[PDB]
Amino acid sequence: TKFPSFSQDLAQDPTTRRIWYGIATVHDFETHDGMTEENLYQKIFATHFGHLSIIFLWSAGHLFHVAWQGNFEQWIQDPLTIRPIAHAIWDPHLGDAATQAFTQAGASGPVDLCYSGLYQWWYTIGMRTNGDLYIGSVFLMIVAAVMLFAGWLHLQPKFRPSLAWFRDAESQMNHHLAVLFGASSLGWTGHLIHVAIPEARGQHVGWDNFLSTMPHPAGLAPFFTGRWGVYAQNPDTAGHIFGTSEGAGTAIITFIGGFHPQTEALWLTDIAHHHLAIAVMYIIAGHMYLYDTYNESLHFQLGFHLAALGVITSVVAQHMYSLPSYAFISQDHVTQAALYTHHQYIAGILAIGAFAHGGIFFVRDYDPERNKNNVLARALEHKEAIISHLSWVSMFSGFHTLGVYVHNDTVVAFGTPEKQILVEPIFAQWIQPFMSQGPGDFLVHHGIAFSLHVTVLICVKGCLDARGSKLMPDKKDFGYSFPCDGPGRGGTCDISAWDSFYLAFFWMLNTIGWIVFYFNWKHLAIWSGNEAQFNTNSTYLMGWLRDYLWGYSAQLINGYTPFGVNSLSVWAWIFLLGHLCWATGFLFLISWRGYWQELIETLVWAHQRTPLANLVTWKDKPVALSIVQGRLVGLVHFAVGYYVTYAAFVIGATAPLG
Amino acid sequence: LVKHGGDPLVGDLATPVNSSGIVKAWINNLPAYRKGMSANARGLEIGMAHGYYLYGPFATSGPIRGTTMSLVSGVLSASAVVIVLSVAIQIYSSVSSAKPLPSVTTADPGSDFGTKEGWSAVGSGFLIGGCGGAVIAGVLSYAIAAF
Amino acid sequence: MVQRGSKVRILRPESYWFREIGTVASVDQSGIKYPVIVRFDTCNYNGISGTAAGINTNNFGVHELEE
Amino acid sequence: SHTVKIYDTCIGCTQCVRACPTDVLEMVPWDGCKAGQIASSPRTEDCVGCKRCETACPTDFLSIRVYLGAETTRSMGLAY
Amino acid sequence: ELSDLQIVIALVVALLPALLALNLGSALS
Amino acid sequence: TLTGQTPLFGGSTGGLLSSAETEEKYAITWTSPKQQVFEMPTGGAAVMNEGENLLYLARKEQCLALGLRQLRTKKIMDYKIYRVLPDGSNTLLHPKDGVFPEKSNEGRAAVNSVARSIGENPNPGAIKYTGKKAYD
Amino acid sequence: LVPCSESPKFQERAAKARNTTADPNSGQKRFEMYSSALCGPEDGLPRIIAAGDFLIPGLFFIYIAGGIGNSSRNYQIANRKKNAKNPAMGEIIIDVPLAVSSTIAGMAWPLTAFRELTSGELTVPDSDVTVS
Amino acid sequence: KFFSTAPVIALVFFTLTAGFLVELNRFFPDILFFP
Amino acid sequence: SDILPAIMTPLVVLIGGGAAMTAFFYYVER
Numbered sequence A: 001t002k003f004p005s006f007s008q009d010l011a012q013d014p015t016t017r018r019i020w021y022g023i024a025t026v027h028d029f030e031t032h033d034g035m036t037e038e039n040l041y042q043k044i045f046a047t048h049f050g051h052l053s054i055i056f057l058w059s060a061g062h063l064f065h066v067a068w069q070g071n072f073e074q075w076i077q078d079p080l081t082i083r084p085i086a087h088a089i090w091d092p093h094l095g096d097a098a099t100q101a102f103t104q105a106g107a108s109g110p111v112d113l114c115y116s117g118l119y120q121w122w123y124t125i126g127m128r129t130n131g132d133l134y135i136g137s138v139f140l141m142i143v144a145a146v147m148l149f150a151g152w153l154h155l156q157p158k159f160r161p162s163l164a165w166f167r168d169a170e171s172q173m174n175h176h177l178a179v180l181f182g183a184s185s186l187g188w189t190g191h192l193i194h195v196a197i198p199e200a201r202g203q204h205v206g207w208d209n210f211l212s213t214m215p216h217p218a219g220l221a222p223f224f225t226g227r228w229g230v231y232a233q234n235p236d237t238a239g240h241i242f243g244t245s246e247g248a249g250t251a252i253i254t255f256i257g258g259f260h261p262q263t264e265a266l267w268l269t270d271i272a273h274h275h276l277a278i279a280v281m282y283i284i285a286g287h288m289y290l291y292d293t294y295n296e297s298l299h300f301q302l303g304f305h306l307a308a309l310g311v312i313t314s315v316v317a318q319h320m321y322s323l324p325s326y327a328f329i330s331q332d333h334v335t336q337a338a339l340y341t342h343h344q345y346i347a348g349i350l351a352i353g354a355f356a357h358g359g360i361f362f363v364r365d366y367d368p369e370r371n372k373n374n375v376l377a378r379a380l381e382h383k384e385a386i387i388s389h390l391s392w393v394s395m396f397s398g399f400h401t402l403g404v405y406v407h408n409d410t411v412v413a414f415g416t417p418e419k420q421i422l423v424e425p426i427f428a429q430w431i432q433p434f435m436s437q438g439p440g441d442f443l444v445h446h447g448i449a450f451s452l453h454v455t456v457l458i459c460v461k462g463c464l465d466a467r468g469s470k471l472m473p474d475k476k477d478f479g480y481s482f483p484c485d486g487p488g489r490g491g492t493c494d495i496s497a498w499d500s501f502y503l504a505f506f507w508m509l510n511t512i513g514w515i516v517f518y519f520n521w522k523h524l525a526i527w528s529g530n531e532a533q534f535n536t537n538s539t540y541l542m543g544w545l546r547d548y549l550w551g552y553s554a555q556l557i558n559g560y561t562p563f564g565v566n567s568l569s570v571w572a573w574i575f576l577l578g579h580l581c582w583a584t585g586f587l588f589l590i591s592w593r594g595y596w597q598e599l600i601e602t603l604v605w606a607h608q609r610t611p612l613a614n615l616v617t618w619k620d621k622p623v624a625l626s627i628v629q630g631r632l633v634g635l636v637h638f639a640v641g642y643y644v645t646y647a648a649f650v651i652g653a654t655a656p657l658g
Numbered sequence B: 001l002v003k004h005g006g007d008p009l010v011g012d013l014a015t016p017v018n019s020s021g022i023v024k025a026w027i028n029n030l031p032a033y034r035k036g037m038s039a040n041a042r043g044l045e046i047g048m049a050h051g052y053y054l055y056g057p058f059a060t061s062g063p064i065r066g067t068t069m070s071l072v073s074g075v076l077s078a079s080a081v082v083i084v085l086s087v088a089i090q091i092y093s094s095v096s097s098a099k100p101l102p103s104v105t106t107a108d109p110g111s112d113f114g115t116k117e118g119w120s121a122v123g124s125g126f127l128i129g130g131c132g133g134a135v136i137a138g139v140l141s142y143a144i145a146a147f
Numbered sequence C: 001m002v003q004r005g006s007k008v009r010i011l012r013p014e015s016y017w018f019r020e021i022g023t024v025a026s027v028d029q030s031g032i033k034y035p036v037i038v039r040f041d042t043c044n045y046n047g048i049s050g051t052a053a054g055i056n057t058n059n060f061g062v063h064e065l066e067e
Numbered sequence D: 001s002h003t004v005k006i007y008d009t010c011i012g013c014t015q016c017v018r019a020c021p022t023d024v025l026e027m028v029p030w031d032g033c034k035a036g037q038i039a040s041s042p043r044t045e046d047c048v049g050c051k052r053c054e055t056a057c058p059t060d061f062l063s064i065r066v067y068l069g070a071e072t073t074r075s076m077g078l079a080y
Numbered sequence E: 001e002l003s004d005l006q007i008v009i010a011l012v013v014a015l016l017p018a019l020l021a022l023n024l025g026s027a028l029s
Numbered sequence F: 001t002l003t004g005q006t007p008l009f010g011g012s013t014g015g016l017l018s019s020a021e022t023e024e025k026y027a028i029t030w031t032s033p034k035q036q037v038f039e040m041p042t043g044g045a046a047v048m049n050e051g052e053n054l055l056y057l058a059r060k061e062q063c064l065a066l067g068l069r070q071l072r073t074k075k076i077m078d079y080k081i082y083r084v085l086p087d088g089s090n091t092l093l094h095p096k097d098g099v100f101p102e103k104s105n106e107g108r109a110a111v112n113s114v115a116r117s118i119g120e121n122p123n124p125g126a127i128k129y130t131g132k133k134a135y136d
Numbered sequence G: 001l002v003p004c005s006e007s008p009k010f011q012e013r014a015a016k017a018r019n020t021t022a023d024p025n026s027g028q029k030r031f032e033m034y035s036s037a038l039c040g041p042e043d044g045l046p047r048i049i050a051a052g053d054f055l056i057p058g059l060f061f062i063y064i065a066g067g068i069g070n071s072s073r074n075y076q077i078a079n080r081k082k083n084a085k086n087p088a089m090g091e092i093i094i095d096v097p098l099a100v101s102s103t104i105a106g107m108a109w110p111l112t113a114f115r116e117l118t119s120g121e122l123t124v125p126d127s128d129v130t131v132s
Numbered sequence H: 001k002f003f004s005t006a007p008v009i010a011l012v013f014f015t016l017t018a019g020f021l022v023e024l025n026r027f028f029p030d031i032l033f034f035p
Numbered sequence I: 001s002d003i004l005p006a007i008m009t010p011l012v013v014l015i016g017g018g019a020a021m022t023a024f025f026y027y028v029e030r
């Protein structure tokens, strides 16, 4: 059957495997039939415009919805008591009770409270009316229209960029550093100085009057002539109220440091300074400006960029709660928990994605001859060593961390908490925005250490053994994703490199889960004033189960009761949806293909033999999902479940507290 | 009544449930299988039967049940379900090549299911029948309630 | 490399016994690409899942083998 | 279908051919090895992919290697 | 606070990327 | 034209489905010394009649399982397997040379024999965008 | 962070204490012993700081771990020298004489370690180390 | 022979090590840190 | 255009989802 157009192997599959594997391989452009590197890069090029158009229409939706259905105005008036709103609920299924309960944040009808700090971010960057947002939205739709127009024009042979424009990666690297990053950085400082900071200081800047307005009275004259001093004018008084004349300074570039007390956020002036500095550094480096493999392999490129975006989004999460850059976001606890957990989980996805494409590189692109004695060749030279070391630090960190937590559990249970192995984080004290690191924090840090070790252990045993191993010397033959080599050599289930990404996603979720668990319990403790609770109970595992999971679940799971619904109903329900989704992942992770294939055989029999029903038949012979599809659907359920459950819990834990 | 295999190599046991006379009589005379019906007729009967049946769960069990509006729900719900089945028949027929094979219960299934012509006919039937069924059942529900 | 007994370190990369000393037990056959038939002390992975024993002797390549 | 490729190091033990449940494999005469035979895979349109052949092969870096692709009715092992 | 004129214009604009998405999608297929 | 007597079998559900008619049956024909009872691969026990017995099964593996596991155990090595198309094209498959594939016979080419051993197969990095596989 | 004696929380914990051992004084003895170590003011629970706390029991642990590792290694050498086939009744069945000799030569690993380190006796060449 | 076999050998050894550590803990009180 | 929710939601979810599922059905079955 035609679909999938690109793969005749599949298109001639007489089964439902054709439809699944189609959708699974529909973006592996490399593997499409008759795909030359030229067309490959051109196709990829156009897809990226599609992606970006999506991101812009996504942002567009944010602004459109908050404008139309939000309470952004009411919130800018009372940003500490008004709950900000994400969008309207129209749902024919809600009972009157649930419409009433979701009728919140002084909204006429049922709404969803926002928890992306979008209100805070927009207030900070200057937006003050629904008009500013509506214009942002319509603008961003038009940007997306342009980006789509672009991908279309580009794939059109008129402007179809040949292999040249892509082979010029070095040019692209320098351009990214300066022309994109540097340029946009200082453009953003433009926005900050002209609109953000004014609107912060109570002065309305529209597109109409900013041509009229000058940011700094003497600033225009100072540029290129003693520019640094004039720019550092009267700094904004602590008295200053955000978006009011009261205590408004005039400085546009400063190094005041710390946080604006009203908003408990990094000074807009400090941010503008930061960005100006970042821009200068980036542009300078641009002007100033494994080679073989990186240019050769698109997998190497994504892998690198994913590991990059991995660390970047991790640090974004780590910094965006410690060093709040948005007004009132520090006070909005649910948003800050949500954003941290969000960005940390996306961090873990981008990280593991890095190692995934790592392994794809090692089975599709890495030629051992091509690079005689490169870093990668040396890495493989002593795989057994890199793995034995990662193994050891894993078994070590693991045995000891689990042992200590279990020791603490045992002695505390036996009613002798004195006997606990409480180790103080001395180096944390030395280094220390920074919150008290106790022996609890120590144990959890080591947990996270161990888990991150086992994750990299797995997703490197993957990318190293991808080429092969004693159990399967020639894996590169069979490729990245394949079921197994059969029950041949004691059994080879899960021997592929894809299987290592699969096995490591679990550890990535465990690791980020420990991270965000620690984050959220610590913060709930402080946000309730019972930081004592964390400090005392975080040292044995029953304390995590009793105080974190058991204790902060109560509100959420009372979201709907036989007595009635409250606003947390939708979260209680999502909480269960995530438990169900997670568990459903176990169906696919534990029950493997053969059981199902026998069962489905019998259903094919029953269908063919049932009068009236037999009148219709499948086009595609029903078959059980593939070995690997079982693993993949398992993992997507497990992951989706994991995320949805925890998102529900993060929201439901923090929301009642505030 | 004993289990025996017609063409023993085929995976189809004649049983009192699939090969009995009473059963063969019923199955082979249901409008799917009944000989000498225009495909449109097959569909109109299948439709009417299902629409009429479908009215009941929707009217009885749904969210606005008890109220007068429940009858309207019943009819529109059943008709919606019939429209969705009408879509299913069209798209099925669009992509279907397969013909109903002769079975133990039905020695001569026919061609009305098994040709794109047949399925289009059946679907036109099924739609008119189903939505008619559903309306009739609401009309009768109002009638009997009033009486 | 002696047929009755030997200590050859296999240089076949796709081998369970790469870099392991083995005692040859068969004369290199004329016209046989891989005639060493080195017996290695350790067993291979060979066998159905949960097969305890495996293969001890493989016909190793002369070029790959080294005294 | 599944490509079954027999590599140089086939010691003609006839183990694979006795394993194959769809008899994809025929032990053919070959002067390459002392055995006087090799494995041939003519009937790879009947290869289900069970790899009982690979499982039965005793050579280190087994000569018989089955490569799964372009699943068909006969590969997928469908009665129906 | 957002008027119907504005809601409509937003929709009509959003229709543009819709058409162009159809176009780009077709291309990439 | 592939004529034998169908083994006495009461019938099952394990048999041929629509694909038998629509696409391709198989047939195993063997010569039985006695009227002995054998496990039907569809599930059940059938009793092979004296002499030539013909069995229509649904895949080759079903046929070769009756043959390799049960018939050959009963020492009946006369069995011939025929792919049967709907038109009635009966095509001998298993003993195509008339000799069991384990026994080497002449006039059977080496098919998919690879010169280079497993070790020496090319890396995919090298052959990227050539459309040649490692084994190929 | 502050001596347990000094910390008022620790004194509270000491007053009402659970006796581990049969003897009534086990609780008081434990707290008296724990008085030496520094404990957090709010918690009043003994903490461990990375020499007496961790280094000394670390050393004892490492000695015992090295002993048991060395004993196992020595017994493995005994296995590969006792018989032509080491595994059969060499691992599944434990030769008590060989084992006790291995244990006796065990716990001398600290002195033995100097000799083992000399000429890299412990390490086997990369070339030899079987790795596909 | 039975004595040689891992299960019995290990059973005795660990029933000794476990008892030894139990006895140690029985005699010496809770030792969190080396005094 | 307070009602635009009560139109846009069924249109997109029911009608668009239906049409999408129908189209994807044709697409993977043709």
Ligand code: CL7
Pocket (backbone or CB within 6 Å): A053, A054, A055, A057, A058, A059, A060, A061, A062, A064, A065, A087, A088, A089, A090, A141, E010, E011, E012, E014, I004, I005, I006, I008, I009, I012, I013
């Ligand atoms: C016209 C401008 C508009 C945009 C850009 C937009 N919405 Mg809405 N939109 C919703 C989500 C949404 C998302 C996730 C999203 C981001 O892409 C947007 N929207 C964006 C739901 C909250 C709600 C659901 C009903 C429903 O979806 O309403 C129809 C929405 C339409 C006409 C806008 C379509 C424009 C989007 C840019 C398309 C994005 C496509 C995507 C990038 C491609 C990848 C697909 C992906 C799944 C892989 C909704 C509403 C709704 C409306 C209306 C009028 C809109 N919208 C309008 C818009 C409902 O009444 C109605 C509302 O009133 O609800 C009460």
Ligand code: CL7
Pocket (backbone or CB within 6 Å): A023, A024, A025, A026, A027, A028, A029, A302, A306, A349, A350, A352, A353, A354, A356, A357, A360, A480, A481, A498, A501, A636, A640
């Ligand atoms: C998750 C880690 C990961 C990341 C972050 C990542 N990849 Mg890969 N990646 C690709 C590109 C890519 C890009 C451009 C990219 C950009 O950042 C990434 N990747 C990133 C293509 C080269 C290549 C093609 C991928 C491939 O062909 O894409 C098609 C896959 C499809 C349509 C399935 C998508 C469905 C999702 C799984 C589940 C979504 C659930 C959803 C939430 C619903 C929830 C319901 C509700 C309750 C919320 C690819 C590979 C692949 C893999 C793997 C494992 C990955 N990846 C992994 C990752 C292949 O094997 C695979 C491969 O074929 O290797 C040989």
Ligand code: CL7
Pocket (backbone or CB within 6 Å): A093, B054, B057, B058, B061, B062, B063, B064
């Ligand atoms: C999506 C989450 C959901 C689930 C999983 C779910 N419901 Mg509800 N759900 C119902 C039952 C139900 C069952 C039995 C069930 C089991 O899985 C579920 N649900 C499950 C009904 C009470 C209610 C009715 C829905 C409604 O009436 O749907 C139509 C019901 C029909 C077409 C099926 C009837 C099945 C036949 C009888 C089968 C008989 C076969 C016969 C033996 C064969 C031989 C024939 C002949 C040869 C003799 C419903 C609701 C409803 C809703 C909603 C939103 C839901 N649900 C939601 C859900 C109504 O508003 C609505 C609400 O109003 O609730 C009062």
Ligand code: CL7
Pocket (backbone or CB within 6 Å): B083, B084, B086, B087, B088, B090, B091, B127, I014, I015, I018, I019, I022
């Ligand atoms: C995909 C090809 C197709 C097109 C282009 C198309 N229809 Mg139909 N189409 C209709 C309208 C229609 C309009 C107004 C319209 C163009 O303006 C179209 N269609 C066009 C309704 C009168 C009628 C019923 C309502 C109908 O299905 O939806 C109402 C039509 C809408 C909002 C206008 C959008 C145009 C869509 C492309 C049509 C969507 C059809 C889709 C396959 C099913 C979606 C889910 C469905 C369960 C509601 C209809 C039929 C139906 C089908 C089918 C298969 C189609 N269609 C198919 C199409 C029914 O059986 C079904 C059938 O009942 O009729 C025989």
Ligand SMILES: C=Cc1c(C)c2cc3nc(c4c5[nH]c(cc6nc(cc1[nH]2)C(C)=C6CC)c(C)c5C(=O)[C@@H]4C(=O)OC)[C@@H](CCC(=O)OC/C=C(\C)CCC[C@H](C)CCC[C@H](C)CCCC(C)C)[C@@H]3C
Pocket (backbone or CB within 6 Å): A391, A394, A395, A396, A398, A399, A402, A454, A457, A458, A503, A504, A506, A507
């Ligand atoms: C509670 C859940 C859970 C645990 C405890 C666990 C345990 C471990 N996983 C390991 C690895 C992995 N796990 C993997 C996939 C998964 N692992 C998962 C779930 C877990 N896995 C899941 C869901 C997956 C996805 C399939 C992979 C892919 C790996 C590895 O490569 C990695 C590994 O093996 O690295 C070498 C180890 C990582 C820590 C280490 O190396 O030594 C630390 C050991 C710990 C923390 C637990 C030890 C338990 C105790 C201490 C042992 C003795 C307990 C008793 C005394 C035993 C006697 C009992 C008798 C008396 C009856 C360790 C054995």
Ligand SMILES: CCCCCCCCCCCCCCCC(=O)OC[C@H](COP(=O)(O)OC[C@@H](O)CO)OC(=O)CCCCCCCCCCCCCCC
Pocket (backbone or CB within 6 Å): C048, C049, C050, C051, C052
């Ligand atoms: C508390 C709830 C119950 C928890 C345990 C439930 C386990 C059920 C798992 C299924 C097992 C069913 C029986 C299968 C029995 C069976 O044959 O399983 C088969 C299984 C694997 O057999 P394989 O086929 O892999 O082995 C292949 C060979 O047969 C030839 O290839 O064997 C093992 O699991 C090995 C480990 C045996 C046991 C190892 C532990 C030894 C110490 C055990 C001490 C027990 C003390 C008991 C005291 C009362």
Ligand SMILES: CC1=C(C/C=C(\C)CCC[C@H](C)CCC[C@H](C)CCCC(C)C)C(=O)c2ccccc2C1=O
Pocket (backbone or CB within 6 Å): A019, A587, A588, A589, A591, A592, A593, A594, A596, A623, A624, A625, A626, A627, A629, A630, A631, I024, I025, I028
């Ligand atoms: C449950 C289960 C199944 C059976 C589940 C199957 C076959 C999927 C069942 C069908 C799903 C629910 C949807 C398929 C039907 C949809 C209606 C498709 C619509 C899309 C069409 C247009 C293509 C497996 O096949 C399997 C394989 C390997 C490991 C584990 C498992 C496993 O756990």
Ligand code: SF4
Pocket (backbone or CB within 6 Å): A483, A484, A485, A486, A487, A491, A492, A493, A494, A592, A627
């Ligand atoms: S994946 Fe399944 S088929 Fe393959 S080795 Fe594992 S159990 Fe056997």
Ligand code: SF4
Pocket (backbone or CB within 6 Å): D006, D009, D010, D011, D012, D013, D014, D015, D016, D017, D038, D039, D056, D057, D058, D059, D062, D063, D064
């Ligand atoms: S590949 Fe193995 S089983 Fe096949 S003929 Fe060679 S040695 Fe025999």
Ligand code: SF4
Pocket (backbone or CB within 6 Å): D002, D004, D019, D020, D021, D022, D023, D024, D025, D046, D047, D048, D049, D050, D051, D052, D053, D054, D066
């Ligand atoms: S995979 Fe199985 S059926 Fe196919 S050739 Fe090998 S042994 Fe024969």
